Structure formats: structure tokens, C-alpha cells
Design an enzyme around this catalytic site. Structure first.
Site, PDB file in Angstrom:
ATOM      1  CG  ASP A 172      95.017  90.431  82.599  1.00 23.64           C
ATOM      2  OD1 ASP A 172      94.408  90.906  81.619  1.00 23.64           O
ATOM      3  OD2 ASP A 172      96.223  90.674  82.810  1.00 23.64           O
ATOM      4  CD  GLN A 219      91.078  78.302  76.471  1.00 23.57           C
ATOM      5  OE1 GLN A 219      90.793  79.503  76.506  1.00 23.57           O
ATOM      6  NE2 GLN A 219      92.312  77.866  76.250  1.00 23.57           N
ATOM      7  CB  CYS A 241      89.947  84.981  72.662  1.00 16.94           C
ATOM      8  SG  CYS A 241      89.571  83.205  72.543  1.00 16.94           S
ATOM      9  CB  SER A 242      95.018  84.324  73.180  1.00 19.24           C
ATOM     10  OG  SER A 242      96.383  84.278  72.818  1.00 19.24           O
ATOM     11  CB  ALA A 243      93.528  79.567  72.432  1.00 19.65           C
ATOM     12  N   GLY A 244      91.386  81.219  70.438  1.00 21.54           N
ATOM     13  CA  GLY A 244      90.196  81.106  69.600  1.00 21.54           C
ATOM     14  C   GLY A 244      89.261  79.989  70.016  1.00 21.54           C
ATOM     15  CB  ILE A 245      89.098  77.192  71.940  1.00 19.62           C
ATOM     16  CG1 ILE A 245      90.227  77.237  72.968  1.00 19.62           C
ATOM     17  CG2 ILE A 245      89.667  76.737  70.605  1.00 19.62           C
ATOM     18  CD1 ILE A 245      90.767  75.863  73.330  1.00 19.62           C
ATOM     19  N   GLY A 246      88.244  79.703  73.955  1.00 17.34           N
ATOM     20  CA  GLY A 246      87.658  80.009  75.259  1.00 17.34           C
ATOM     21  C   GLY A 246      86.561  81.056  75.200  1.00 17.34           C
ATOM     22  NE  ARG A 247      89.454  86.053  77.562  1.00 18.35           N
ATOM     23  CZ  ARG A 247      90.472  86.905  77.696  1.00 18.35           C
ATOM     24  NH1 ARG A 247      90.623  87.924  76.856  1.00 18.35           N
ATOM     25  NH2 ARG A 247      91.343  86.737  78.683  1.00 18.35           N
ATOM     26  CB  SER A 248      86.490  82.388  70.396  1.00 18.80           C
ATOM     27  OG  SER A 248      87.426  83.399  70.092  1.00 18.80           O
TER      28      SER A 248
END
Ligand SMILES: [Mg+2]
Length: 281
Positions: free
Chosen positions: A180, A261, A214-221
Site C-alpha cells: 500500500d 512517481q 495501475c491507478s494513475a497508469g504512471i508509477g507501477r505501470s
């Protein structure tokens, strides 16, 4: 090399400085379409938008907007579509993209609920007998099978285009154990996840680009495709130590904003590539 840099940044403690330099040099390009008032409800966050030049366009027009970008990596011959977690009102649009772009796999790197909040609509069916119909985009989605493992789940889905009656098999690769807060301590399971997606064929030229979110599509993605692409380049080149991860990241940022991020995500990206390179020998 790379080892040397990782080790130097660790003992000097300069991950934020290295990461801020990336943000400074990162490309800026217009997002005219994203910022249209009619597309307000199509965006999860106000500070994460696709560039006009690389945005994925829906064909069923009237409104062709979706918060998704094509990251096209020339040298590595690899393409990805990075997109936000679907909203309650954009689940139909997402499966329209998947269809129209001829994708084979969807890679999901978030849970539906994290930190007590919904980060993603429930856009796929959970029981075989309870299929989903998306009336606005005219698609049917049926869960065919599910394989739950300790760090990830894989689902076979059937996407039916109801107007043509064609059906396609779509593989859902769901990484379930990203913590998390922050990043995982070992990249082992993330790498095993990466190789599992590779092994499906979902990253190969025969198919349309994989859809990653992912949620925003920039970090984990961003971590996912940065690692994949760096690892490919190390296989392809003579002298694999020439692969500069920051340069590859800046190249990806030409196609979508804010990829990676945090400085911990940068550190983790490095860590994954380094260890991933040692596995392939
Ligand atoms: Mg059952």
C-alpha cells in the site's frame, strides 16, 4: 556498470537529487484533448493526462478520448499502452481500446481497493456464470478461468464484439502484492511476474500492444515497462553495460508524463533491472 551507480547513489544517499533531475529534463507536450471540459469525468487525476501526440484514440467517435498513451520503443521493438485504472463510466471505453488496438494482454499492478479507497473500477467479471455486458461500446466480457497464486493471478477472459460477433481471448495478468505504501523490498516476485507476462506472448509483435495500468497508469505501470525494455536492450546490444536506465526513462517520458512517481520507484526500477540481468545468463 549500473551496479556501480546504484551502489554510489546508495552510499551517498542521492536518490531524490537523481530523480528530480529526471523530472527537470522530462519532456512537456500539450494535452489539449484531455483538458477539454467534456473529458473531465474520463480522467481519474487532474495532474495525469496523455499527450495529444501519443494518446490512444477510440474509433466509435462522438468522443474518442481515453486516458491512455502509446509508449513506442524503437530500439527495443516493444510497444506498450499505459492507461489509468478504469472509472465507473470508462469501463466500456477500456474494453473498446483493448479490442480496437488488438491487444492480447491486460497487465494490472493495483488492487481494486487500496488504503481504504477505490483505486479502480471492477471492470472484469469474477464468476464464470455472471458475464458483463458493456452496452455503450457493445462488448461482452466472460471470465473463462482463473489461476490465483501467491504474488499474482492470471485470468483468461473472452471479449466478444457483439456487432460483428467475433470473439477474442484476452489474458489478464494481475499483480496482487504491491504494498500500500512505497515499493517491494525484493524485486523477485515482480520479475517472476514480468517473465510470466512475456511467456504468454502478450508482449510480442504478432499482437497489438499490451495494456498496462495501475491507478494513475504512471508509477507501477512505468516501472513495469522500464524494466522490461531495459532488460531487452541488455539482451540485444553488444556491451549490455551501455544501457542507461535514466535515458530510457526519459525516452518513455516523451510518450507519457510522470513515469516513475517517486525516488523509491526509481531505486526499485534499477534494482529490478540489475537482478533481472543476472537471471538471464
Ligand atoms: Mg464457481
Amino acid at each position: 556498470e549500473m551496479e556501480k551507480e546504484f551502489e554510489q547513489i546508495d552510499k551517498s544517499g542521492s536518490w531524490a537529487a537523481i530523480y528530480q533531475d529526471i523530472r527537470h529534463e522530462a519532456s512537456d507536450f500539450p494535452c489539449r484533448v484531455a483538458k477539454l471540459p467534456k473529458n473531465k469525468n474520463r480522467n481519474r487525476y487532474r495532474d495525469v493526462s496523455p499527450f495529444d501526440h501519443s494518446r490512444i484514440k477510440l474509433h466509435q467517435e462522438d468522443n474518442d478520448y481515453i486516458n491512455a498513451s502509446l509508449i513506442k520503443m524503437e530500439e527495443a521493438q516493444r510497444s506498450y499502452i499505459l492507461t489509468q485504472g478504469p472509472l465507473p463510466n470508462t469501463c466500456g471505453h477500456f474494453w473498446e481500446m483493448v479490442w480496437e488496438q488488438k491487444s492480447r494482454g491486460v497487465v494490472m499492478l493495483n488492487r481494486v481497493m487500496e488504503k481504504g479507497s477505490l483505486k479502480c473500477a471492477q471492470y472484469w467479471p469474477q464468476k464464470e456464470e455472471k458475464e458483463m455486458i458493456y452496452e455503450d461500446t457493445n462488448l461482452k466480457l466472460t471470465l473463462i478461468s482463473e489461476d490465483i497464486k501467491s504474488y499474482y493471478t492470471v485470468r483468461q477472459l473472452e471479449l466478444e464484439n457483439l456487432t460483428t460477433q467475433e470473439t477474442r481471448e484476452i489474458l489478464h495478468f494481475h499483480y496482487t502484492t504491491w504494498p500500500d505504501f512505497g515499493v517491494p523490498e525484493s524485486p523477485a516476485s515482480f520479475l517472476n511476474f514480468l517473465f510470466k507476462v512475456r511467456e504468454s506472448g502478450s508482449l510480442s509483435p504478432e499482437h497489438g500492444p499490451v495494456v498496462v495500468h495501475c491507478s494513475a497508469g504512471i508509477g507501477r505501470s512505468g516501472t513495469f515497462c522500464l524494466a522490461d525494455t531495459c532488460l531487452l536492450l541488455m539482451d540485444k546490444r553488444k556491451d549490455p553495460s551501455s544501457v542507461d536506465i535514466k535515458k530510457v526513462l526519459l525516452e518513455m517520458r516523451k510518450f507519457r508524463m510522470g513515469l516513475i512517481q517517486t525516488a523509491d520507484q526509481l531505486r526499485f526500477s534499477y534494482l529490478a533491472v540489475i537482478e533481472g540481468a543476472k537471471f538471464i545468463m
